[model samples]
Target: MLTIYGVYRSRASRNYWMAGELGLPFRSVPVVQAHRVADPLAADAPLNTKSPGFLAINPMGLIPAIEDDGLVLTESLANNLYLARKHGGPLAPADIREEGQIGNWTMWAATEVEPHAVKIVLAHDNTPEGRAEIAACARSLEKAFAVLETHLAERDYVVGDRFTVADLNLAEVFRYTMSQTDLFKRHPQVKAWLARCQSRPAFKAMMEERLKEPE
Candidate 1:
């Protein structure tokens, strides 16, 4: 059986949601953030990305680590994409090139979009320093959102006409970002797309589980 490590409150939420979409039965290993006594940095806070055990799972010490069938995986975006391609049936792309397109947007979500989104999140919710950085990242995120808004103007999903892994992957990042900012409100098309993505039964189930946790 697949064993998914990491707390529901962390990026692992992304993977959990995808696993549900793929209809994969798996075990969840919930590791609480190391208590304040564990390290002065308190870096291992379950919700904090810089936890010691989380680091062991992922050198970067990121949240949302997964141990599936003895294979360990980290990084929310990578985890979701991998699950979709490997386990998702119709949700996975049928064509290799189409899969590539899905991957393209997945990477874009991590590289082009996540940085700015993280900034906004940390700034408004974390610390003054986080806020300062988020202030700087806002403009870049706006530009990125504009591009997405344009692309989503006519399409329901990121790569295919129907919902796919690419849509699932990017939607999590967008949801994470919107929790901190009204960035999506500026783009009506993107807003509608996000609504559709979040409304998925799998996504809803994941959110319900996540809401029960204390981050």
Candidate 2:
């Protein structure tokens, strides 16, 4: 009975993907960023990120916000973690200790990996200035990917022996990087692990939904 705000193509997709991965039923509010035909919820949408309705749900007026039984939640990474813990599913580890570990990696992905992934995409697909800024961010992304590669070389996941919320969070962000560049080629372990994650039925379902949405 969670009601997730934001459109399907926004970062909220990460949360939705996690929910689907766990087979959780939730409602999606029809909140689209104004004036964008290709990507309705893009940051450049008419209301931008400061629309009155959005500010009411999240003071920061961010998308990917959710209202779960009157409890409002914001921030993509935090929201995904909340859903995973509360909904109870395979994406959440069985052991409490491993759960903490999952949290640790999720934070790592948010802090260390996401920015770089974002930068790579922007740099490759935007204006000259935007591309330059993204290029500068890629140095840090390189280091982050190296760290992930080392860990993935030995283990199949970011946390537990099985897929967990940590992997769900990181994998989606990493998928962006793979789409923007061939960076994964340098890290075979990361590549293989990502391929395995994408192979999941839930992940595939989410992708199918995304394909039908405005790009």
Candidate 3:
């Protein structure tokens, strides 16, 4: 059986949603962060991203590690891609070109968009210092959103008409930026796409399960 280590509150939710999307039966370890930090050396403590038990699975000690038939994997997007490809579903790329496109969009979204969005989210304050940083991040995010909006205007998904890992990864990033309600209002296409993606039964189930966990 595939065992996923990490709580829903973390990026592990990405893997959980992917497994659900693929209709795969798996076990969720639900490694609570607080429990891990509270007793890092406890014999039965939950496996946290930085715990030795988790590090054995992922040297980087990042959440969203998966163990399938002794094959350990790390990185949320990478894990999603692996499950998609292994399960041979519509979410996986059809050919080499599509694979490259998926990689391109995933990398672009992670490197170009998520950072700025995270910066804005972390600095969500009204102080003069926070305002300047938030404004700068907002400007950068606007440019990224324009690119996505224009691309999505003519197509529903990132690579092709069908949903793929590209859409999943990019949509997750867009979901984070959605906190900027006014900014999203300017990108109707992106906002609509995000809604469509997040509305999937798999995504909805993952989010619902995540809500059941401690914050």
Candidate 4:
């Protein structure tokens, strides 16, 4: 059994998606971010990043920590990789080469795209500064999508033939950019592959849980 900390609206969504795909039994502990609450110090506030209990588990005060057996991982992607490998299935790496590819795509998506992609979600104030930030983010995201678009020219997925943890990780990042349809249109291959990845039952199942939570 595993205990996954953090709410679905946070990076914990990635772990939830992985658990759904691997059919792992997990208990979801909704550790809401302190910033998400107006008064995290209030007695009525839910268990949050600033809470003593959660801080003991992860002093980083971040979402998406996992307690599986005696192993604890504080990173969202790390949580997914552990689940896939420990569960030992098709989504897990088959060899050193597969491991490298999977790891590469996961990190690439995080570093190259997620920062900019996430801006699109939170920088929509319609102010001059907000518009400028959106423009800058689009430039960065489009550049990153160019790389992914080329990679997907002949493949349906990022890592291997069938959907794998690589697809799941990358898709999670790209999901944040779904509202930028014009950008996606420019990267045709990446757009189609993203759609294919999210169409999986596992992704659909994860999103259902995510939607039930407050934005």
Local accuracy of candidate 2 as per-residue lDDT tens digits, 9-118: 77888878888877778887746554444553555554434566677888876678888888998888888888888877777767789878888888888887887788
lDDT of 3 by residue, 9-90 (tens): 7778888888988899999986656443777667766667657767777887677789999999987888888887788779
lDDT of 3: 0.82
Q: Which is superior by lDDT, 2 or 3?
A: 3
- Most TM-score-accurate candidate: 4
Steric overlap count per candidate: 4, 0, 0, 0
* Candidates in descending TM-score order: 4, 3, 2, 1
Which whole-number lDDT from 0 to 100 does residue 141 have in model 4?
79
TM-score of each: 0.84, 0.85, 0.91, 0.95
Output the worst ten-in-a-row residue range by lDDT, candidate 4: 122-131
Candidate 3: worst-modelled 10 consecutive residues by lDDT: 118-127
What is the Å distance of residue 36 in model 3 from its true position? Answer: 7.9
Residue 185 of model 3, lDDT score: 93
Off by over 4 Å in 3: 34-36, 42-45, 124-128
Please name the candidate that would achieve the greatest lDDT relative to the true structure: 4
Screening candidate 3 with a backbone cut-off below 3 angstroms (N, C-alpha, C), the clashing residue pairs are none
Kindly list the per-residue Cα lDDT of model 1 for residues 145-210, writing each as its tens digit.
Answer: 899999988898878799988888888788757864466667889889999998889988998998
Total backbone collisions, model 3: 0
